[PDB]
Amino acid sequence: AGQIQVLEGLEAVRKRPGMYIGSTSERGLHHLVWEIVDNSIDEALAGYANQIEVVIEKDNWIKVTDNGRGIPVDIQEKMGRPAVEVILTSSVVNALSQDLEVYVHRNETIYHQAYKKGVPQFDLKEVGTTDKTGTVIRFKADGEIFTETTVYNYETLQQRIRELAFLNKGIQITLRDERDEENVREDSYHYE
Numbered sequence: 001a002g003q004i005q006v007l008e009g010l011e012a013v014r015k016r017p018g019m020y021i022g023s024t025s026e027r028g029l030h031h032l033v034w035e036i037v038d039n040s041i042d043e044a045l046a047g048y049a050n051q052i053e054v055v056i057e058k059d060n061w062i063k064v065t066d067n068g069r070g071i072p073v074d075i076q077e078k079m080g081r082p083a084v085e086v087i088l089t090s091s092v093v094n095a096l097s098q099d100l101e102v103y104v105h106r107n108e109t110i111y112h113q114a115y116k117k118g119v120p121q122f123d124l125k126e127v128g129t130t131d132k133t134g135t136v137i138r139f140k141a142d143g144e145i146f147t148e149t150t151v152y153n154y155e156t157l158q159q160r161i162r163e164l165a166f167l168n169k170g171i172q173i174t175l176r177d178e179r180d181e182e183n184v185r186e187d188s189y190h191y192e
């Protein structure tokens with residue numbers, strides 16, 4: 001019943017996306033970023049993370065990284081599925097992404113899963129080792145949903161990242177634009 005209730009949730013989000021993110025215009029596209037960054041901010045307010053990085057990659061992929069505990073990977077009681085899977089299959093940003101990847105650094109291990117329109121493409125896998133902890137999410141907004149534009153505006157992202165760092169003192173938040181490999185722009189904010 002749990003996996004079924006996942007699938008229906010994905011269908012609900014993709015059918016009426018503006019009811020979930022306000023709009024499917026440029027404002028809604030940027031809201032994707034905010035939803036991811038807010039969870040990293042919670043991890044910092046919980047006392048675990050202090051660095052967040054937002055990268056505009058080639059072809060308008062977004063990469064968000066935090067140095068928190070890593071979204072958990074233990075098998076759930078209620079879903080029979082890894083915890084990270086449960087959280088990402090319940091995610092609006094994942095449902096509204098043509099593709100999304102997660103890498104978790106936790107338990108000295110790197111775990112990876114990829115999704116399309118919220119649907120896992122394979123079971124969570126151990127891909128490497130690490131001596132760090134944290135979460136990386138990389139997603140590509142679905143152009144079937146975001147029919148006006150899938151191009152992010154650096155200044156929009158910059159303004160709000162600066163605000164978030166000034167509000168959440170102590171967290172280092174970095175924005176980087178790598179869309180033109182010949183001219184990479186970075187702003188990094190860290191108050192008090």
Ligand SMILES: CCNC(=O)Nc1cn(-c2ccccn2)c2cc(-c3cccnc3)cnc12
Pocket residue numbers: 036037039040043064065066068069070071072087135136137
């Ligand atoms: C790059 C975007 N990064 C994230 O989304 N980071 C997190 C979201 N979540 C999260 C968890 C639940 C619901 C929604 N989001 C977390 C939970 C934990 C966590 C909690 C308890 C023990 N160990 C780790 C740690 N990082 C996260």
Ligand SMILES: [Mg+2]
Pocket residue numbers: 035038
């Ligand atoms: Mg949220």
